[PDB]
Amino acid sequence: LKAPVFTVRTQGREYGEFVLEPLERGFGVTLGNPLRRILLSSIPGTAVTSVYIEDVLHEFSTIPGVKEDVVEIILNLKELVVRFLNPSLQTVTLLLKAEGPKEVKARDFLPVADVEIMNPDLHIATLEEGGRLNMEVRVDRGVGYVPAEKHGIKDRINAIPVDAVFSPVRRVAFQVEDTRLGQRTDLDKLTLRIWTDGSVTPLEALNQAVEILREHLTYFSNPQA
Amino acid sequence: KLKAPVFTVRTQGREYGEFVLEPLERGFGVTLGNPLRRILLSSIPGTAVTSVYIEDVLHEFSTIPGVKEDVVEIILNLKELVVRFLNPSLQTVTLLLKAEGPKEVKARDFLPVADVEIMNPDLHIATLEEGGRLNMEVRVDRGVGYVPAEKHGIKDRINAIPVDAVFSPVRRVAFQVEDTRLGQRTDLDKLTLRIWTDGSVTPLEALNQAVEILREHLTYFSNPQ
Amino acid sequence: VFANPDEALLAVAHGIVDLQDVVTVRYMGKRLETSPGRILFARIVAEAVEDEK
Amino acid sequence: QKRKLQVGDKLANRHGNKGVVAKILPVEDMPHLPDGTPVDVILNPLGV
Amino acid sequence: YDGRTGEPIEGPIVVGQMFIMKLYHMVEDKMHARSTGPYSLITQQPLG
């Protein structure tokens, strides 16, 4: 069977559809599923790893003038999407200094070089008059899900480790349709649907997934007795 | 990250083999094992008997006078025939077998053809009695997977009986994933792949071909539109 | 009509027949009329005890 | 201490079905809908 | 669909949304091991 045609349909930086057709019968699941597993587990991303709040010793506490407790704030920070524009960048510290009353969003972080916030409207905390929020959020780069109990990263004494979910891919689905080429009617049409948080485009995640699968296939070489 | 895994091979003869890949990242035993098993069972090129002609026989459900086996049993024996084409250009052949009773017809009784090898020449075809005549024409083709007789319906002559084409040299595949550790990492995978073949291709050869098929398909995600 | 259990379970892999379909298989010199699932069960026991007979 | 769900913890619904977590699977191992949504919990029908 | 193989479960499955509770019985509070330790006064047997 000849080389399938590859089609790409992307909506911004967060959704994309990738079509491969025609394929031999059964190759929709042969190609689609290994890619889905790699996309959902093994794509590097960035995540908040440690947060330091001035005048806060642990996460089981509240801040004067701030409506949320530290636990709620850290949950909000876990939804922060940070995109590194430099491939060699491994870590960053985002600084936020706010005085009440105001709605502190992710857009309130001080700008950093080669760092972009993908969800500026993320709500972080609500400050009442007389409340202040001075915090340093450390964002690292990695793969998988590393609980705070494992990395235990603290840039300083009172810093609070945060469970890290590094995967940029949000949802993966693939569709197998009944295509036909010539007189053969059992051919497959594979369509991969990839949802990302925006830091990595779906096309970038797909290329990284293909390279990971290609690299692993090279391990079936140099057999040993 | 993890270092490159070790690939070990334990092959007994030309028909069974065990291949171990370890250590692997969590979940990669399934990621690699499932696609390879599917490719092994449906995509390895092979040869099979696709049509048989027996003199004086009308339909597959009849019985030949002077031979112990009926038409159904003879066709079943032919489906066990392992034949290898030594010429890549050769696409199809016809094996001729003229036998006289009371010999026990074997696969070796086929008239030799150029660049065609019977891998199992001791295969039993039929048993003839005094006065039994077996004039049989068997058509051997090239293909992959399993194709039922009613699907291809290949007939060389009138009264020819289409026979189910067992093209795949791989007889059976069974892969296993075990939990292993490397120091303080406890969620590693160990992949064991077991392959039964008919002997025309070694299990290692089939595994190498399956990896190449997956490798080739991964390159299809290369040129958008 | 399958020449042996391996061919019958290959057809099941390709979706030709289900495990619960009653077909004809040749197993241990007998032309049995059973389903691929029952032939699969026989192989399960045979391999666990490593004695087909 | 902030306790997360782990193997050996006990879960229950309001209808008397109770059990302990015996396996935590990665997201890519769980059964998923055709739209790509993985399920969160798998319950044995033999308990009903 | 099965997340490991990508093949569908051979039969339709009952999937839905259910309210499940995390009960007070946690393995963290119940795992206990002892080699040697305190003993009783009169019988000198291990405490419980």
Ligand SMILES: [Mg+2]
């Ligand atoms: Mg995130």
